[PDB]
Amino acid sequence: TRFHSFSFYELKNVTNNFDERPISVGGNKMGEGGFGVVYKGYVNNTTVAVKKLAAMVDITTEELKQQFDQEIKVMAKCQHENLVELLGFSSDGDDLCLVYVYMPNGSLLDRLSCLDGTPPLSWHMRCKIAQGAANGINFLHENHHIHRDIKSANILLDEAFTAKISDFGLARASEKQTVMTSRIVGTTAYMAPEALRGEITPKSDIYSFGVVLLEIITGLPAVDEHREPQLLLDIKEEIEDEEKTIEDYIDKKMNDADSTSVEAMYSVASQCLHEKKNKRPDIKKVQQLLQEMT
């Protein structure tokens, strides 16, 4: 064993009975996803993030338990500066909690949208975050794991804006390697075409990272129901068809972006976004191209 086993009452005590008010207004709520809500807490003077798993999407209790077990297994095997650190968990009763080191700058998604009044990320910080995220994915792939849910909401940022990959509940270990599933899971706006069908491959993680690189350049979320186009990957088509340029989509909330490094990041993203999985570069090549960029 490597993680502290908490009793559920202890985590109820340290999160102020899972206070639903936002942290910005003195509550404990930091965010939510399809598989749970994240609360801020204090455990023995340590600031923690407590993910209470109770489902808000179409998932069964046994599927939640499988994702909880999967997260613990991946966390026990993978430790890296660009991966979040699991401190412990609670499993007593019908409730499941995962306890982590708190992330002072929350998620990349929230920082790109300046949620809660945080200042816009400079181009220089965006480049370092992209490099950190690729190093995290590279470590996971080297250790034969496929993330299956890479998105900006799953890239967290510490006090220094060091990128940290999170949410390993859907991660798959692969010794051999394309395989199939009957339960399609993930965020549609980021998912590779084959992943949307049910294929499981490390090449899908590359496609999803390409979408993240477009959110970093543009400051636009991957999907926006009230936007034209609603899907960010459609801008790649508009740019490829010469109807627009990447310069027309650069986030206006920054003053330090230069055309050379922006075009270089866009080139990495377009390569990641090849329709044909085998045309996409491997994570070590993505890592190398992002290093050449700076």
Ligand X SMILES: CC(C)Nc1cc(Nc2nc3ccnn3cc2F)ncc1C(=O)NC[C@@H](F)C(C)(C)O
Query: Residues forming the annotated binding site for ATP?
Result: 30-38, 51, 151-154, 167
Q: Minimum distance from CB of 37 to ligand X (Å)?
A: 8
Which residues inside 142-201 make contact with ligand X, applying CB under 6 A? 156, 166-167
When binding is defined by CB under 6 A, the residue of 14, 15, 51, 190 that contacts ligand X is 51
Query: How many other CB atoms sit within 10 Å of the CB of residue 23?
Result: 17
DSSP 144: T
Q: Are 283 and 139 in contact (CB under 8 A)?
A: no
Per-residue binder mask for ligand X (CB under 6 A), 85-124, x = binder: ---------------xxxx-xxx--x-----x-x------
Total residues interacting with ligand X, rule: CB under 6 A: 20
Please give the backbone phi and psi of residue 199, each rounded to the nearest 5 degrees, phi first: -75, 145
Structure tokens at 294: 């700076």
Q: Which residues belong to the annotated binding site?
A: 30-38, 51, 151-154, 167
Q: Minimum distance from CB of 30 to ligand X (Å)?
A: 4
DSSP 153: G
Indicate if 149 belongs to the active site: yes
Catalytic residue of the set 58, 116, 149, 282:
149
Which residues inside 12-41 make contact with ligand X, applying CB under 6 A? 23, 30-31, 38
Which parts of 73-144 are beta strand (E)?
A: 86-90, 97-101
Find the residue with minimal CB distance to ligand X: 106
Q: Minimum distance from CB of 254 to ligand X (Å)?
A: 18
Q: Are 97 and 6 in contact (CB under 8 A)?
A: yes
Identity of residue 112 = L
Nearest 5°: CA angle at 218, between 216 and 222? 75
- Token pair 């991660």 is at which residue? 171
**Contact residues for ligand X (CB under 6 A)?**
23, 30-31, 38, 49, 51, 84, 100-103, 105-107, 110, 116, 118, 156, 166-167
Residues recognised as catalytic? 149
